[PDB]
C-alpha cells in the first residue's frame, strides 16, 4: 500500500565521421607524347599505373 | 623521334700502294695495312703513271 516510485531514463550515444578528398595526377610533355617508343604509348601506361 | 639518322655510301676504286720496292721477277708485294683484303684471286692489276 505505498506510492509509485520515481522515474528514470537514459539517452543514446552519438557517433560521427568525416569525408576525405582524394587526388591522383599524371603528366607528360607534348614532345614525349608525339615520340613513338616501344612498350606502347606512355600516356596510357601512366594512366593505368595512376 | 627528336633524333633522326641516315646512311650514305660511296663507290670508289680499288687502289693499292706498294710500300717496299720490288724488282722485276718478284712474285710477292708489300702494301699498306689492310689494303690487300679487297683483292682476291683473278683480279687484274696494272701499274699506274702520272
In short:
In chain A, 26% of the residues lie in helices and 0% in strands. The first copy, chain A, has two helices and no strands.
Written account of the structure:
The structure is cut from a larger assembly and holds two copies of chain A (50 residues). The first copy, chain A, is built from two helices and no strands. Chain A has 50 residues and is an all-alpha fold. The chains hardly touch.
N-to-C series of helices and strands of chain A: HH
Q: How many helical stretches of chain A?
A: 2
Q: Classify the oligomer.
A: part of a larger assembly
Basic shape of chain A: rod-shaped
* Main sheet characteristics of chain A: none
Number of strands of chain A: 0
How much of the sequence lies in strands of chain A comes to under 5%
Structural class of chain A: mainly alpha
Q: What is the rounded Rg of chain A?
A: 32 Å
The percent of residues in helical segments of chain A reads 25-40%
Outline the secondary-structure elements:
The structure is cut from a larger assembly and holds two copies of chain A (50 residues).
Chain A: H1 30-34, H2 42-49
List keywords for this structure.
virus; 50 residues; viral protein; major capsid of VP1; part of a larger assembly; 2 chains; 0% strand
Amino acid at each position: 500500500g505505498s506510492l509509485a516510485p520515481k522515474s528514470a531514463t537514459r539517452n543514446p550515444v552519438k557517433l560521427n565521421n568525416f569525408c576525405q578528398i582524394f587526388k591522383k595526377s599524371y603528366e607528360i610533355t607534348k614532345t614525349a607524347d608525339a615520340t613513338k617508343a616501344r612498350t606502347g604509348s606512355a600516356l596510357a601506361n601512366d594512366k593505368k599505373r595512376r | 623521334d627528336p633524333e633522326f639518322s641516315w646512311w650514305e655510301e660511296k663507290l670508289t676504286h680499288n687502289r693499292l700502294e706498294v710500300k717496299t720496292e720490288a724488282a722485276a721477277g718478284v712474285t710477292t708485294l708489300a702494301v699498306d695495312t689492310d689494303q690487300a683484303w679487297a683483292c682476291v684471286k683473278g683480279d687484274i692489276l696494272m701499274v699506274e703513271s702520272v
